[PDB]
Amino acid sequence: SLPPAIFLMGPTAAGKTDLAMALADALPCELISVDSALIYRGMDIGTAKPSRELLARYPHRLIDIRDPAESYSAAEFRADALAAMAKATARGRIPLLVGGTMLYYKALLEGLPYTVAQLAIAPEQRQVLHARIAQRFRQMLEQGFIAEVEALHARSDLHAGLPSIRAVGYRQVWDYLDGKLSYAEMTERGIIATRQLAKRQFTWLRSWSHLHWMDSLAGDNLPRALRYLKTVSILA
Ligand SMILES: [Mg+2]
């Protein structure tokens, strides 16, 4: 009789964090981030990290747990997630792992003493996701993405080749700061990189079994999700 757990994956910008918070208000959950970039402190705007205020009312595990000068392996995620899941479970809370880093989920499922319900969200038309990706990136620039990266760029202990700087978009802003690119080239290439990420995520997901999809444009995802729980043998 393995305790319950929820997986909420999908491409970047699909609306995973949004739905997770919604679900966090419907059931006793423990939000656990599954994102290789959100682990880094000081990388909030460019990574679409939930605001300080939102995190206060929707605490996430595995967020701001590492300095940008540090590395983080899928193996460390593995141990960290298992720890967070056991801790949440002992409290009666349902582990809700939400994120788009597929290698992490993979590491957990393979390398799980839980009855896992797997959800995935994305638009039916990929063109819709691309438009959002482009617009969200432009918003990041307005919210201070460049100044955010300037602070990293100014650290002598950081360089463009580090795992943290590989977070999509950061390398482009970094090169801009090095004066290698124009503002336009930085924007376009940053959007391309993110679109490339979404493509890699769809490839992981398309061959992913036991997934219950949902539409990013749907407005009744909350009730739709709460209903699936029973299907995979889970009494909520
Ligand atoms: Mg998110």
Curated annotation (Swiss-Prot):
It catalyses: adenosine(37) in tRNA + dimethylallyl diphosphate = N(6)-dimethylallyladenosine(37) in tRNA + diphosphate. Keywords: ATP-binding, Magnesium, Nucleotide-binding, Transferase, tRNA processing. The record marks T101 as: Interaction with substrate tRNA. ATP binds at G10, P11, T12, A13, A14, G15, K16, T17. Its cofactor is Mg(2+). Pfam families: IPPT. One of its GO terms (molecular function) is tRNA dimethylallyltransferase activity. GO terms for biological process: tRNA modification. Residues 35-38, 166-171, 199-206 are annotated as: Interaction with substrate tRNA. Substrate binds at T12, A13, A14, G15, K16, T17. Its EC number is 2.5.1.75. HAMAP family: IPP_trans (MF_00185). NCBIfam families: miaA. Catalyzes the transfer of a dimethylallyl group onto the adenine at position 37 in tRNAs that read codons beginning with uridine, leading to the formation of N6-(dimethylallyl)adenosine (i(6)A). Belongs to the IPP transferase family. Monomer. This is tRNA dimethylallyltransferase. The gene is miaA.
